[PDB]
Structure 1
Amino acid sequence: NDEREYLRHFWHPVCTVTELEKAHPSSLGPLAVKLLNEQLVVAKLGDEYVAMRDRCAHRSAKLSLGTVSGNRLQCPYHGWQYDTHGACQLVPACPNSPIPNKAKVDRFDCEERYGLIWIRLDSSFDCTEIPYFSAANDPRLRIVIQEPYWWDATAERRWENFTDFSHFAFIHPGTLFDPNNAEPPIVPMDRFNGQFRFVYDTPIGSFSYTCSMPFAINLEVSKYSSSSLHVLFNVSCPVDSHTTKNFLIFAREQSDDSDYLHIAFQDLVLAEDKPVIESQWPKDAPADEVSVVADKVSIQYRKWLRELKEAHKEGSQAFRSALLDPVIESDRSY
């Protein structure tokens, strides 16, 4: 728990906009979500997406069992009404008495982007941004948001599974494995603007990764001589110590085919990964795991996470430098 405090400083996705709209017939929420083992409630009050602790200040009922009425979230028990800042503005039992100063619940940064709702629990370092999705606002690409998928595995283990190629022959022999490539070689990895950037050439094409730390991956798959750009954007919500809620958004230039051709293929790949990733134990990678040279991406990821954790302990400027300082291995200029 002590181990995870630095993660409160990043933006994490908690639901799709669709999930929020489907939660209650109002289409405005509320929706209960859980992030880093914190119980939160999300709602649309007026034009704004709001995130609060899911716990009424009065008698601790869950506001996620309440009702959105315009610009208020009403508690289901004694009807206290909370505004967009988390402050109670109506105590129905005492409508003329002054509202206690303590009648407020914690309110957190909450923004929509790419069709997902993002929450940042701690904004005090003021140096993190919502992860980068390269296909946003590209009018050449059709964008599809998949339904979220829940895994009994941590966000770190999910991230390392997504960026590893070594497992293709064994987990994805008929779906992703390329017998003409088999073992892609180690590549240079750059840190830039709080992202890992690395590229694999096929060259006939390229797999270009832009990974916004700590849990988001933007993968651009391109081919020359063809206009066949495909973008996969994967991000894991660290729900608690053993669970992730995962979001996949994909974009494609050739969009005359069915969205479900791609959804079904992506779901097959995920079904192949799922039982093996969920089997990994203990849930957090212990020091006794044995790496080999082909594990470069995982090794460098673990190293940067540990540096962020240590920098968080030293405070805001140390964290901003650990996250945002460039570290270039490649021949590229950014």
Structure 2
Amino acid sequence: TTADLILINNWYVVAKVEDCRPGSITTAHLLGVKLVLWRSHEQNSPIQVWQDYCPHRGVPLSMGEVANNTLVCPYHGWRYNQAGKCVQIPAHPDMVPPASAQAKTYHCQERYGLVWVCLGNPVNDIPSFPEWDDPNYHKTYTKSYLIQASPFRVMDNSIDVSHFPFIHEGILGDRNHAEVEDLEVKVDKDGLTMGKYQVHTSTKDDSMVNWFRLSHPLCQYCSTEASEMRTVDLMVVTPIDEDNSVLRYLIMWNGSKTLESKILADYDQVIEEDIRILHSQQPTRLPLLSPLPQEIHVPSDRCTVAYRRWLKELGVTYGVC
């Protein structure tokens, strides 16, 4: 609503396809807009994403029911077809509903088992995820995490690597290996790419090789390679509004399928360790570079500074300060 056109015109994940099943009604919130998500009882029916608002008298359509490939609002029973047009008004069953009688519909695309939404007119496509079609990679999904922090602070914390030995001790690092190597960062028209850097953990030694790339500011493609196992993930942040976010991960890996529950637990521990910091930080919104006291930057922050720099040019004013 008060978000910049550059965010309104991008794709974001609002749900996993698994939490929307045939006949269901679910709700989401994206950039200050309340959304209703529904499908027909039909197997493989498409997913509609609309503003959660019946235009007759302002009741949430989410409180309605799916019946006969239509969503029926629960106040006066108007029925809206899959295109959002009202097709039956029960008070006047032979009146053709006025043209006005139409739900606000949004672009929706199902990809990687994720439900993607764009509130405006999409200028880019949904980010790539090459491993999706690779049969030697297994896949899994975290649950969704509600976070009381800017979406841009969520991504800022995910781009920050020097904190691993301190809040992620025992999984991504340890206090006896806290020094950070030179980090190569490039911001270009592709997006922000951080070059391969090395993580101490639990083939030369107890370390891993990681890189990541952001084609868009709220979706991150990460890669980590162990001795004989590669894991990749798509991290994707729902910007609920300027101060609140949903975090989800799609995770694929080419090692044993027995690692799934271990990966799920590792992510849950790391995410919760991050949330404790994120909820604590002030200000709530992500501070941008100088064009309480101003944020200080040392060399291991060069990727975080590049992110703030990239947001400034991108003209992001929403959820930042």
Question: Shorter-chain-normalised TM-score: which range?
Answer: 0.7 to 0.9
**Aligned with residue 213 of structure 2, among 187, 204, 210:** 210
Which stretch of the first structure deviates more once superposed, 213-222 or 129-138? 129-138
1:96-111 map, 5 Å: 96-111=94-109
Which stretch of the first structure deviates more once superposed, 206-215 or 138-147? 206-215
AA aligned opposite 1:38 = V
1:173-252 map, 5 Å: 173-177=169-173, 179-180=176-177, 182-193=179-190, 195-202=191-198, 206-223=209-226, 226-252=227-253
Report whether the alignment pairs 1:290 with 2:296.
yes
AA aligned opposite 1:206 = V
Please say if residues 193 and 214 of structure 2, whose CA atoms lie closer than 8 Å, have aligned partners that are also in contact: yes
Residue 74 of structure 2: aligned partner: 76
Q: 2: distance between equivalents of 1:221 and 1:168?
A: 14
Q: 2: distance between equivalents of 1:109 and 1:3?
A: 17
Q: 2: distance between equivalents of 1:220 and 1:190?
A: 18
Superposition deviation, residue 84 in structure 1? 2.0
Superposition deviation, residue 220 in structure 1? 1.1
Given the superposition, is the C-alpha separation of residues 258 and 293 from structure 1 closer, same or farther in structure 2, using an over 3 Å criterion? closer
Q: TM-score by structure 2 length? A: 0.87
Please say if residues 199 and 206 of structure 1, whose CA atoms lie closer than 8 Å, have aligned partners that are also in contact: no
Report whether the alignment pairs 1:300 with 2:277.
no
Is the partner of 1:211 in helix, strand or coil?
A: strand
Superposition deviation, residue 98 in structure 1? 2.4
Please say if residues 134 and 231 of structure 1, whose CA atoms lie closer than 8 Å, have aligned partners that are also in contact: no
Is the partner of 1:48 in helix, strand or coil?
A: coil
Is the partner of 2:308 in helix, strand or coil?
A: helix
Q: 1: distance between equivalents of 2:57 and 2:79?
A: 14
Alignment coverage as a number of residue pairs: 301
Superposition deviation, residue 4 in structure 1? 4.0
Report whether the alignment pairs 1:63 with 2:78.
no
Q: 1: distance between equivalents of 2:77 and 2:256?
A: 49
What's the CA shift string for 1:246-273, capped at 9, x where partnerless? Answer: 1111111012414211111111111211
Superposition deviation, residue 2 in structure 1? 4.2
Residue 115 of structure 1: aligned partner: 113
Superposition deviation, residue 188 in structure 1? 3.3
Runs of 5+ consecutive residues of structure 2 not aligned to the other structure:
289-293
What's the CA shift string for 1:140-189, capped at 9, x where partnerless? Answer: 10000111111111111111111111111221122211545731322131
Runs of 5+ consecutive residues of structure 1 not aligned to the other structure:
22-26, 312-334
Please say if residues 184 and 200 of structure 1, whose CA atoms lie closer than 8 Å, have aligned partners that are also in contact: no
Identity %, equivalent residues: 28
Superposition deviation, residue 3 in structure 1? 5.3
Q: TM-score by structure 1 length? A: 0.84
Q: Which runs of 4+ in 1 moved over 6 A?
A: none
